[model samples]
Target: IFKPEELRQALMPTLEALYRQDPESLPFRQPVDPQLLGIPDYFDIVKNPMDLSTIKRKLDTGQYQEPWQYVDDVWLMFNNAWLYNRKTSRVYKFCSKLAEVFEQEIDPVMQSLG
Candidate 1:
């Protein structure tokens, strides 16, 4: 079974790769007004070495109001900006890997719960 920590460890690097590719060029910026749907202030998270913990806390606390709404924002960001950026190629590749991990490890747990 995939632990939350393991998934988090796997996912953080993908996000970090995305961040390093273009910090200022992102569709959104940090201190991201929990009301908005941007990159989630990841720059600060990375700087502070708390990327995973901060995201986990935000997620656990329902900071986004609706979790899926955050997902929507992420999709919008990806489609609008990152998808076309040659600099983000590795981010795209890593994200694909993250997806595979989710499908193989996370999805089964969700399915069993249903």
Candidate 2:
């Protein structure tokens, strides 16, 4: 359904720019192992990417202040993980998943506007 070179062309600039940016301003930076950099194959990475379920497993208790809090945390986790793993495809998947979840969850409220 997707072409590899097209995906690379679409993604590399943003990934390269984000990777080039300062660690502080970038949301994804962490002092992770350098060897983990530049690993491709986002399908594998995002297939089991961190989500609310992963966070709950880590915390061993469900205590998010709100549903949005979980959303924010999962986003941050994916950001840092992408920096650490250098998986741009996973980052894209993370964003796509976020949009999917938000639209499903919030579109009802937005429907009132239309």
Best by lDDT: 2
Candidate no. 1 TM-score: 0.35
- For model 1, the stretches where C-alpha displacement exceeds 4 angstroms are 1-55, 62-84
- The residue-level lDDT of candidate 1 at 26 comes to 39
Range of the 10 consecutive residues with the lowest summed lDDT in candidate 1: 44-53
What is the per-residue lDDT of model 2 for residues 1-114, given as tens digits with 9 covering 90 to 100? 323443333323323333343432242434222346545554454453444334444333434433444445545655655544444555445444444444454444324322
Against the unseen true structure, what C-alpha lDDT does each candidate score? 0.41, 0.42
Q: Write the per-residue lDDT of candidate 1 for residues 20-97, one digit (tens) a residue.
A: 534332333343332364556544433322222345455445455433433344445444333433555654555444
Off by over 4 Å in 2: 1-54, 57-60, 87-114
Pairs of residues at least 3 apart in sequence or in different chains that clash in candidate 1: none
